[PDB]
Amino acid sequence: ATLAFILYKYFPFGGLQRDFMRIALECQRRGHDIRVYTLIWEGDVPDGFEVLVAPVRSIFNHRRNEKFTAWVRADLDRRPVQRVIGFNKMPGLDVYYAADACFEEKAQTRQWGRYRHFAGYERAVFDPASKTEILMISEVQQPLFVKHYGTQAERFHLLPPGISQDRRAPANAADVRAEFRREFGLEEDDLLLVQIGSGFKTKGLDRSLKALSALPKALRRRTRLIAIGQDDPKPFLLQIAALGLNDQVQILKGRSDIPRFLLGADLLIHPAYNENTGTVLLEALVSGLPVLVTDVCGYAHYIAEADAGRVLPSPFEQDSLNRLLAEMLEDAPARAAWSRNGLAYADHADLYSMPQRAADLILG
């Protein structure tokens, strides 16, 4: 009856990790024991989950991961399960949840060990002779996987989103908003930008900050940014110092009260360099928080489609971002429309049901 779930890292504050957790909980609800193999588990263990932290070690993450596989398989050979579900690419998965973009594609934007390892493990899932079922959440990547490996179409299953319910604006949103802004010292005429999620460099924190720096006087004195993620802030503190933004930027470690931030803020800014999907984009949306996002993000189309913010087309130019941010912030009418647009869309679209649909496919 047991399901073995594999991922390299569990922590509470990542997209891959919250997806794994919500799927796993649902399979358990459905009457399954839950085994989990991992290199690290931070935060609570739900009741009934057997969590196996692997004792393997290397000065190279790529080799560490190869050892991890052999370790896992050695345990699984001795203790069989019904099905093996992996959230990272490696051999021996029955199902793969594609929480990462296509590696081989990204590479081309040879001889090195890291390249051959990560490409080797991708092919391990996506090769035509592999029997791994693939759970897709970014539509855009499927054709890239097929271009590079020729994976069969029958093997792919596109899931809708799995935003948790707590992210949806509550009936007392105005009260949550006022309490939050009272707490952080934000007045009616202050503007809060929030940049949410770990991976500050990849999600374009540097771009956000330049764009804050380049706002016209009247908007600049009114604007502050809070970034929320596990990353080392120190590489950005130097940027923040250079640009004179000490008094109007803060960077916080990961935390579980993201919905309060979503309600208290005036804009989600997310000018990612690259992103498989971007759960927070939609989390902003169901909170009624306008989004500024680049078009490379897999979930960007939802912002354009619900008219709940602006999507900045490629190629990225700092100058365009600057302009777009200033214009979204000058336009209080536009912002009100995008909040209401987001909330209404949240009431239509299936943005929630990914875990049940993911459970269906794993279980049959």
Contact footprint for its own copies (CB under 8 A) = 1, 28-33, 44, 47-48, 82, 164-166, 168-173, 175, 363
- Pick the binder of ligand UD2 from 249, 258, 284, 312 (CB under 6 A): 258
Q: 354-363 and 15-29 are packed helices; what angle lies between their axes, rounded to 10 degrees?
A: 60
| Residue from 225, 203, 199 nearest 212 by CA | 225
| Residue 44 contacts which entry, its own copies, ligand UDP, ligand UD2, none (Cβ below 5-8 A, type-dependent) | its own copies
Residue 40 exposure: Cα atoms within 13 Å on the Cβ side: 8
What's the CA gap between 168 and 238, in Å, rounded?
36
**Would you say 86 is a known binding-site residue?**
no
Binding mask 94-133 for ligand UD2 (x = CB under 6 A): -----x----------------------------------
Question: Which is closer to its own copies, CB of 174 or CB of 241?
Answer: 174
* Interface with ligand UD2 in residues 152-171 (CB under 6 A): none
Q: 332-348 and 279-287 are packed helices; what angle lies between their axes, rounded to 10 degrees?
A: 100
254 binds ligand UD2 (CB under 6 A): yes
**Would you say 276 is a known binding-site residue?**
yes
**Would you say 132 is a known binding-site residue?**
no
What's the CA gap between 197 and 171, in Å, rounded?
26
**8 A C-beta contact, residue 65 and residue 8:** yes
What's the CA gap between 267 and 3, in Å, rounded?
40
| Residue 61 contacts which entry, ligand UDP, its own copies, ligand UD2, none (Cβ below 5-8 A, type-dependent) | none
| Residue from 227, 228, 246 nearest 238 by CA | 246
Dihedral pair phi/psi, residue 83, rounded to 5°: -155, 145
Q: Which residues bind ligand UDP (CB under 6 A)?
A: 13-16, 18, 196-199, 228-229, 254-256, 258, 277-280, 283
What's the CA gap between 278 and 236, in Å, rounded?
22
**Shortest distance, position 299 Cβ to ligand UDP, whole Å:** 8
| Residue 19 contacts which entry, ligand UDP, ligand UD2, its own copies, none (Cβ below 5-8 A, type-dependent) | ligand UD2
Residue 114 tokens read as 């890291």
122 Cβ neighbours under 8 A, 6+ residues apart: 89, 102, 103, 104, 148, 149
What's the CA gap between 92 and 73, in Å, rounded?
8
**Would you say 278 is a known binding-site residue?**
yes
- Pick the binder of ligand UD2 from 3, 16, 23, 265 (CB under 6 A): 16
**Shortest distance, position 79 Cβ to ligand UD2, whole Å:** 27
* Interface with ligand UD2 in residues 169-198 (CB under 6 A): 196-198
Question: Which is closer to its own copies, CB of 3 or CB of 226?
Answer: 3
* Interface with ligand UD2 in residues 225-244 (CB under 6 A): 228-229
Dihedral pair phi/psi, residue 25, rounded to 5°: -55, -40
| Residue from 129, 130, 138 nearest 92 by CA | 130
Binding positions for UDP: 15, 18, 167, 203, 255, 279-280, 283
Binding positions for UDP-alpha-D-galactose: 15, 18-19, 99, 167, 203, 255, 275-277, 279-280, 283
Binding positions for UDP-N-acetyl-alpha-D-galactosamine: 15-16, 18-19, 99, 167, 203, 255, 275-277, 279-280, 283
